[PDB]
Amino acid sequence: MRYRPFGSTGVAVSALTLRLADNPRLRANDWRALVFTALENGVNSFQIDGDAPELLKGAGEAFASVERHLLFLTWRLRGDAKQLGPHTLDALKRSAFEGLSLDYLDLLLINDPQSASLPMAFESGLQDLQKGRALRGLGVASRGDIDPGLLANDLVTAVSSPYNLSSGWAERHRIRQASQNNFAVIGEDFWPQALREVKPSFWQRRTDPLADVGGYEFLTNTPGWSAEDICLGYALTEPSLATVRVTADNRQEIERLAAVVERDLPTGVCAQIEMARFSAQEREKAARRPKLAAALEHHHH
Ligand SMILES: Nc1nc2c(ncn2[C@@H]2O[C@@H]3COP(=O)(O)O[C@H]4[C@@H](O)[C@H](n5cnc6c(=O)[nH]c(N)nc65)O[C@@H]4COP(=O)(O)O[C@H]3[C@H]2O)c(=O)[nH]1
Ligand SMILES: Nc1nc2c(ncn2[C@@H]2O[C@@H]3COP(=O)(O)O[C@H]4[C@@H](O)[C@H](n5cnc6c(=O)[nH]c(N)nc65)O[C@@H]4COP(=O)(O)O[C@H]3[C@H]2O)c(=O)[nH]1
Ligand SMILES: [Mg+2]
């Protein structure tokens, strides 16, 4: 395992962050062994995305096996961020603090509320948790530009965004810009939907309709490497990411994901990523209108 500053904290996080999310086929002992295997492969950053009693017991026990200060524990909190309130903080005392046997969270990661502001009562409660040294930072998950009024909030120390070799320019730039302004950046979706083929399949993300995937055929035809392993290896070279989020269900999946950290991308790949992005942007150019006359016609409905 390699480690990286979770910037401006002096806390080092593993380049892999293991996500634990509800899974009814696992018991306490399985979650416990899942985290023991992570811990043995040098993973020290976890994101709990779930409140199944089985998961909190098992994760709880395994975290206890080592000293709290060696761990970076993020609690993922979903839902319309505009409807968070005291009920949220109650749920959080029960699940995240009592459930996991913790007296601080390194990070609480909420959804982008698409607003400069968080609800009064919730922000007050976070301020209280921080005064009590129970919450080191608030993080925001986004697929777009977070309101600068929110980023300027003293509470907000981190952002979570998808980054993968499908990622546009606008994305690549948002996360370097964030990281150069001393926000930690967690990388999501290293192995995105667009780059899997040989069912149903949802496409409800505002970034989805605009998405080239021509040129990634080398993902399949690289001797000694799976497409998943290349996509991850690539995310691990982006210097603006504090860490890359991964999800894994069994020991050998953890071990294989850890292996990728210490292997380097195959020899020709960086070159081919350029070939594919240079074709991506010859197509976005060759399929563009004059940006004035376009916008000006659009105005005149
Ligand atoms: N382009 C695209 N890909 C899609 C879409 N829906 C699912 N995928 C792909 O399928 C994975 C798992 O989807 P899931 O089962 O909902 O699993 C998701 C879901 O349970 C949750 N999640 C992620 N984003 C959102 C979100 O905006 N809202 C909600 N409510 N849950 C989300 O986190 C899990 C992991 O997200 P990922 O790690 O990215 O992994 C996602 C992503 O790779 C979509 O509309 N567009
Ligand atoms: N189950 C599932 N649903 C998905 C997934 N991807 C997108 N969606 C759905 O699509 C809606 C809009 O997603 P977006 O356009 O990325 O817009 C998202 C995005 O910018 C942000 N967001 C929410 N969850 C996440 C997350 O896990 N990671 C990041 N990076 N942004 C998130 O909040 C916006 C609104 O989130 P929602 O209201 O949840 O609404 C989400 C959710 O209902 C997925 O993988 N799984
Ligand atoms: Mg701030």
Minimal CA–CA distance to 46: which of 29, 79, 68, 25?
A: 68
Tell me which residue has tokens 């696992």. Answer: 26
Q: Is the CB of 205 under 6 A from ligand 2?
A: yes
Nearest ligand to residue 167 Cα: 1
Say if residues 172 and 163 touch (Cβ distance below 8 Å). Answer: yes
- Quote the tokens at residue 31: 């979650």
Q: Is the CB of 144 under 6 A from ligand 2?
A: yes
Sequence-distant (6+) residues with CB within 8 A of 27 are 54, 58
> Cα dihedral angle (107, 250, 245, 126), rounded to 10 degrees?
-20
Q: Which atom of ligand 1 is nearest to the CA of 191?
A: 43
Cα 197 to Cα 149: distance, rounded to the nearest angstrom: 40
Which helix (H) or strand (E) segment holds residue 6: the answer is none
Sequence-distant (6+) residues with CB within 8 A of 148 are 116
Binding-site annotation: residue ranges for Ca(2+): 22, 51, 112, 114, 127, 145
AA identity, residue 38: A
Minimal CA–CA distance to 259: which of 240, 232, 237, 227?
A: 232
Cα 134 to Cα 97: distance, rounded to the nearest angstrom: 9
Task: Give distance in angstroms: CA of 154 to centre of ligand 3.
Answer: 4
Cα 174 to Cα 168: distance, rounded to the nearest angstrom: 10
The DSSP secondary-structure symbol of 7 reads B
Q: How many CA atoms lie within 13 A of 138 on its CB side?
A: 23
Which helix (H) or strand (E) segment holds residue 105: the answer is none
Say if residues 185 and 241 touch (Cβ distance below 8 Å). Answer: yes
In DSSP notation, 208-252 reads SSS---TTGGGGTS-TT--HHHHHHHHHTT-TT-SEEEEE-SSHH
Backbone phi, then psi, for 108, in 5-degree steps?
A: -110, 115
User: What kind of fold does domain 4-301 have according to CATH?
Assistant: TIM Barrel (3.20.20)
Ranges of each domain in the chain: 4-301
Probe residue for ligand 2, chosen from 204, 241, 247 as the CB with the greatest number of ligand atoms within 8 Å: 204
Phi-psi label, residue 153: left if phi above 0, alpha if psi -120 to 50, beta otherwise:
beta
Q: Is the CB of 200 under 6 A from ligand 1?
A: no
AA identity, residue 152: A
Q: What method was applied to determine this entry?
A: X-ray
Tell me which residue has tokens 């799976």. Answer: 226
Q: Is the CB of 67 under 6 A from ligand 1?
A: no
CB count within 10 Å of CB 109 equals 21
